[PDB]
């Protein structure tokens with residue numbers, strides 16, 4: 358599914374992402390936009406054999422099992438395929454686990470690049486959330 362920006366903002370707010378581990382909602386909408394253009398089916402293969410999956414582009418070296426990644430740890434304890442559904446439940450559950458590690462939201466390259474230190478008001482403007 359390709360989510361609409363406010364549609365995604367509502368689903369994230371409903372799921373307790375607003376303020377999760379101290380990260381306000383706009384943070385999550387901004388990273389989703391730059392990581393996947395709001396597409397739950399987005400996939401990106403890396404030079405290292407890993408692949409990034411879903412709306413949050415979660416990497417198969419550490420978080421999920423895709424059966425073809427060298428030295429994979431599967432910390433979320435899921436199949437990477439579960440990160441590509443229209444339903445965001447599993448992706449959200451795994452994103453919540455990722456941000457608890459020491460690097461926090463800095464785990465996401467797109468966040469470090471396009472969202473960190475920026476004015477993110479625009480990402481939730483007009484959503485009424």
Ligand SMILES: CC(=O)N[C@@H]1[C@@H](O)[C@H](O[C@@H]2O[C@H](CO)[C@@H](O[C@@H]3O[C@H](CO)[C@@H](O[C@@H]4O[C@H](CO)[C@@H](O)[C@H](O)[C@H]4NC(C)=O)[C@H](O)[C@H]3NC(C)=O)[C@H](O)[C@H]2NC(C)=O)[C@@H](CO)O[C@@H]1O
Pocket residue numbers: 403409413414415416417418419420430432455458459460464465466467
């Ligand atoms: C630019 C590019 O090629 N790639 C990006 C890709 O980097 C993004 O995926 C990110 O990959 C990085 C690099 O592998 C991941 O960071 C590692 O994350 C693990 C897990 O948190 C860290 O190990 C943790 O280390 C802490 C501190 O020592 C320990 O407390 C924990 O025990 C250990 N946890 C476990 C469970 O092993 C490791 O240190 C990180 N490495 C570095 C150098 O920071 C990052 O998690 C990952 N992000 C996501 C969202 O999957 C990816 C997404 O932006 O896109 C591009 O492909």
